Design a binder for this molecule. Structure first.
Ligand code: YMX
Length: 287
């Protein structure tokens, strides 16, 4: 089951950032010799969060693929609680897309090594890699339920992995709609059946992948940024389609549309989506 780790073996360097979960730190783990790792700490860690911690750790232990952030274990001595991960140096995929879009170079400075917007090849490589993670999850009849670029990570070499299972959801982010009470839904990434009746399936994940493609080729824009969430619920539910992004080739748009068929069983399978993206990333390798 869940590998445990001794607090003494975890040395915190510095905060990488904060979230709903809590802080994430760069750290040095020992005995895995001497190693660089990401450590997510728990903000509250009282009761509900203490057993949602149980869940995530068990889940992350379960999953093992080159496109899922690797998990090493936890540390339950004292407080607050910690999860330990491999280190992805370029952070979340959403911020990475936006900062490396058509004003990466046109707005750089000192701490700016090798700017220039991301090209077609790089975008496809990001897309194919997120697909692969998802092919894997579909294979285990696993349903993510919150696939979006904010829950992917980027590591050195444009290595992109799925890194979070939306276990902690930002109460204050427009990316989420409070259905009622404490339940937050990422409605802009969800299809009609999920928005109306919370039917989550591998076919609702493929829809969300479609939307991830859209985020990728708009360089990180929020789907339906023009709309508030209630307006967006009405469009999505009425059958409205996001526009082909400026940077998006027609063939990539046709894939998005295959992920967005209205009837779930008519959506393209993630496996076929993955293959078709890989073919496209192949055919552009040398241009
Ligand atoms: C250009 N800059 C470069 C530096 N930078 C970074 C870099 C790395 C992280 C970070 O925590 N990385 C993680 N590595 N492994 C994780 C596992 C797990 C996690 C948790 C997680 C998973 C995920 F899929 C998305 C996340 F935002 C956070 C992180 C790492 C990092 N952390 C913040 C990213 C934004 O959210 C707050 C923390 C920032 C910012 C951009």
């Amino acid at each position: 089951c869940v590998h445990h780790i001794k607090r003494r073996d975890i040395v915190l360097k510095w905060e990488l950032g904060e979230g709903a979960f809590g802080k994430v730190f760069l750290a040095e783990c020992h005995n895995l010799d001497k190693m660089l790792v990401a450590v997510k700490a728990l903000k509250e860690a009282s009761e509900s969060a203490r057993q949602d911690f149980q869940r995530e750790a068990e889940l992350l232990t379960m999953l093992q693929h080159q496109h899922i952030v690797r998990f090493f274990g936890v540390c339950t001595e004292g407080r607050p609680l910690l999860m330990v991960f491999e280190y992805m140096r370029h952070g979340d995929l959403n911020r990475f897309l936006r900062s490396h879009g058509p004003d990466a170079k046109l707005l750089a400075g000192g701490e700016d090594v090798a700017p220039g917007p991301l090209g077609l090849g790089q975008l496809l490589a990001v897309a194919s890699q997120v697909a692969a993670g998802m092919v894997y999850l579909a294979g285990l009849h696993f349903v993510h339920r919150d696939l979006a670029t904010r829950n992917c990570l980027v590591g050195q070499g444009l290595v992109v992995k799925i890194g979070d299972f939306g276990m902690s959801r930002d109460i204050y982010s427009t990316d989420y709609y409070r259905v009622g009470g404490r339940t937050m839904l990422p409605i802009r990434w969800m299809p009609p059946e999920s928005i109306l009746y919370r039917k989550f399936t591998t076919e609702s994940d493929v829809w969300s992948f479609g939307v991830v493609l859209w985020e990728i080729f708009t360089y990180g824009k929020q789907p339906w940024y023009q709309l508030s969430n209630t307006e967006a619920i009405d469009c999505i539910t009425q059958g409205r389609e996001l526009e082909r992004p400026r940077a998006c080739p027609p063939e990539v748009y046709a894939i998005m549309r295959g992920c967005w068929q209205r009837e779930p069983q008519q959506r393209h399978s993630i496996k076929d989506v993955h293959a078709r993206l890989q073919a496209l990333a192949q055919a552009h390798h040398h241009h």
